[PDB]
Design a protein around this ligand. Sequence first.
Ligand SMILES: Cc1cc2nc3c(=O)[nH]c(=O)nc-3n(C[C@H](O)[C@H](O)[C@H](O)COP(=O)(O)OP(=O)(O)OC[C@H]3O[C@@H](n4cnc5c(N)ncnc54)[C@H](O)[C@@H]3O)c2cc1C
Ligand SMILES: Cc1cc2nc3c(=O)[nH]c(=O)nc-3n(C[C@H](O)[C@H](O)[C@H](O)COP(=O)(O)OP(=O)(O)OC[C@H]3O[C@@H](n4cnc5c(N)ncnc54)[C@H](O)[C@@H]3O)c2cc1C
Ligand SMILES: [Cl-]
Ligand SMILES: [Cl-]
Lengths: 471, 471
Amino acid sequence: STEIKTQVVVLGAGPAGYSAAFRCADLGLETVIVERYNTLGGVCLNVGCIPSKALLHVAKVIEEAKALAEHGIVFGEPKTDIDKIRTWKEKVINQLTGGLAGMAKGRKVKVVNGLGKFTGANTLEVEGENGKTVINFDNAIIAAGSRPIQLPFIPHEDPRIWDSTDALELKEVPERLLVMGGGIIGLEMGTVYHALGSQIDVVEMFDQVIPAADKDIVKVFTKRISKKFNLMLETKVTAVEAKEDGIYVTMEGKKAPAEPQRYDAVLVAIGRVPNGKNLDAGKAGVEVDDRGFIRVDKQLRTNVPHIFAIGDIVGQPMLAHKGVHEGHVAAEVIAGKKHYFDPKVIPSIAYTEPEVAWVGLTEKEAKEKGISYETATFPWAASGRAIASDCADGMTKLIFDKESHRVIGGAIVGTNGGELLGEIGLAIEMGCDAEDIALTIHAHPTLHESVGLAAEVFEGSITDLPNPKAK
Amino acid sequence: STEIKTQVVVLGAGPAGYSAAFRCADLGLETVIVERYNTLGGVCLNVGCIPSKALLHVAKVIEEAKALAEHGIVFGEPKTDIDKIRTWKEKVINQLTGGLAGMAKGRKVKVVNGLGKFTGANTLEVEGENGKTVINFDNAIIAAGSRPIQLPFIPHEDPRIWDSTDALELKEVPERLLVMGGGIIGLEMGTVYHALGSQIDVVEMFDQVIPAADKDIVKVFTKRISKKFNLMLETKVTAVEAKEDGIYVTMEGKKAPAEPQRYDAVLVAIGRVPNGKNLDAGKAGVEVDDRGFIRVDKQLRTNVPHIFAIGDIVGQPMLAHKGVHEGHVAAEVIAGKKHYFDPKVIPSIAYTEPEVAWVGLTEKEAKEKGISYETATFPWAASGRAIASDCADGMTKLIFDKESHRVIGGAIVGTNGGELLGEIGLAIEMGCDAEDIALTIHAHPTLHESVGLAAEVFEGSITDLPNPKAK
Ligand SMILES: Cc1cc2nc3c(=O)[nH]c(=O)nc-3n(C[C@H](O)[C@H](O)[C@H](O)COP(=O)(O)OP(=O)(O)OC[C@H]3O[C@@H](n4cnc5c(N)ncnc54)[C@H](O)[C@@H]3O)c2cc1C
Ligand SMILES: Cc1cc2nc3c(=O)[nH]c(=O)nc-3n(C[C@H](O)[C@H](O)[C@H](O)COP(=O)(O)OP(=O)(O)OC[C@H]3O[C@@H](n4cnc5c(N)ncnc54)[C@H](O)[C@@H]3O)c2cc1C
Ligand SMILES: [Cl-]
Ligand SMILES: [Cl-]
């Protein structure tokens, strides 16, 4: 029963949403953000990328410290206080949310807290702390994100059945943990809890973890990870039963045990689904597909031209950077600029150890597309830096169009591997060929020089590896 | 004496030398390498880049392990065995040497061990393990490297007066160590020994460590390091005297103490000089300058057209990657290709913690060149990744031509900062502008996305910082 009139309303304050809102404000538009939770930053900041990366950094340091022992530096076994780790995680998060609130204030962007739902083509109704707020807008930006997949046969109401948020709460270190899903989130959480002392089982229906990534990359990764996790591929969960002494899980498939297994906790990390069906978007005339996605064009417009949608809710890949860039474009289009969201590439990174990172076309995709392509790889066993840094199990891979010589894809498996994507990404966006990359002088000794070296393998000029293109 | 005939003789088996030799072989030329010492890889592999990076990795892990205590993971004080660390260092060197030997064998490149000197324009004489060998060549490639600077008033015959090789031998951990020279090598060794327990003093004649780098970058580094090291800037060593209980060093300048200071060891890391005067190059008609450089053109030719020179011995910067690329060009030119060595940029990295890395023009150089430029920086205090990884003091800086918007230089201070140079390097080589970089989608949350964000700061679209370019 309180009414507001604004130019732009943004539904959701995640990466996509707040980036869109801030861009609108910087472009001189009157902008209001609606968010059901009490802080900004959405899933990414509060229960996603950031806390997971904090805990993963902790895990990495623990394992490195232990790995120093054979080289003459012996730390004891660490004394660990989970409450303190949790407190630190919360500190990084609170620092960042404080930052976002500060920036919203600085850009004079009003934040309305509560559940927003459309009531008309130009009207969004918010139910929150201050009662009901009716927001009349010229433009709306839908950025309401996604949520974890739940399965009907699983008692998701038992506290020992976790999703990613539960896992990131760090309630305890379960003696035995099952991760359902060999995707990125599952493997990352597995990494975290393994470093803390948990015994890790991973169950995955596909024949490979991180299924979109190439076989050769994932092979290095799997070789590394099979020493610490019990990987059960091409296997599925058929039943989950809560009992007093634990969660009993029945599996069927190639690596399934005969008997149901007892776990102290089960992380259900099957995937995520969009929140498009929860907005009464139809009342604004907006089309929502059967899977809950709100599909948009290259200017991020829904079927209703003055209503935009960005981020996870718009489609895959569900990644923060995609949402940020989409938000920027939507804001710019609303401001009247003729901009489009049409990136050649979108990078993906699994912050496991070693990291698995890739951008552009994978070899799988290249073979299905049927274009003449050639791969070039540099093994980290040949890298001075990787050996000197005790991380020789890695590989840098570039994929080239055979005729044009343009780089069309790249991948790294290795410590700090993700940090190498930038160059590759830039290279693809600029339409670089192998010669461009190879002739650029990369610093030695670094991990990223492998990018250059891979290019050299293609050029046939490589001298840090045997050169089969020699004569 | 034994006499042999070859197409190409390469004097020196360092990065430059073996890269040139391997490239010549890959191009179908009969090739012989001459090396006075019994190992391959030269300074870089044996007493330079590789061992220093190994020890620095050890130091970094020790410090991170200690830093976890504040977050709830408490390792004890480490129990350290210096003999075992040294053994590990030696192991990385040996593995890599083995690799190089394997590659030389595979390319059918013969290695003649001994001291090489020119006797004529087409004759090089080697005195070595297999006696004296006379090599008649069509082309020679001089790659005989550099050596540490010594000072006449310093008793360099005392075992407590070190150069970098001594430091890398790791014979003991001196309670108190003086590093003379605030260059990269000195700071790296200071980092290693501080991590091992040494108290570190650094003397530098200039008003900043790493004088070649911009002041703001080094300011960020200096703030981190001034708590761990006693930095004496604008200070000079006037006397060094060996006594029974230690080495007494007298210094003058603003933060130098009045009285001579006692150190258990002194590392002399003032710089390196080329080995050009020690080859009898004059007997081949080759011109050597007064300080020992053998100056060369863009095809790496000396004043004698069939004689080439590459690496440290030809000029600054004395870095491995420069030498490798020069070696490739020299080999290609000898094979009859119209190739040139003329890179737009050559990257530099100090592997301190945080790392200090830069490529292209610094602000000093841009001013000195008279270019109208604009800088754009992203502070790591605003990076989710840097905060979550406990490395928030960093900074990423891009320098753009103000009119063309082309990137002309870049720099990073921060953990893993060096790994970010590749993208920047590539961007400058490709003549990218701020928009090219900004519109490339960088993965979140990473350290390298800062590069993209820095570009956004220039473009005026940044939403992860306040945007003073806003409307
Ligand atoms: C554990 C985990 C790790 C991840 N790791 C990475 C990673 O490393 N890199 C990466 O790029 N991505 C990662 N992701 C995914 C990343 O978090 C998402 O892609 C990103 O958060 C999407 O941003 P968004 O703005 O589209 O949606 P969200 O971040 O989900 O924001 C949507 C916001 O809208 C609010 N909202 C929803 N409905 C309403 C409503 N009706 N009214 C008002 N407010 C509403 C929600 O509360 C939420 O704050 C990870 C995700 C998880 C769960
Ligand atoms: C401690 C330290 C750290 C360093 N860190 C880095 C770094 O991080 N990154 C980087 O890029 N660079 C670094 N450098 C420098 C790098 O090591 C050199 O730039 C590189 O080794 C130069 O290669 P080169 O082939 O030109 O010379 P060298 O590697 O010195 O090779 C010359 C070789 O020729 C031999 N030789 C000399 N005279 C004769 C003769 N008359 N007959 C036969 N053989 C002869 C020598 O024994 C030597 O093996 C570092 C150097 C040091 C000392
Ligand atoms: Cl299932
Ligand atoms: Cl029961």
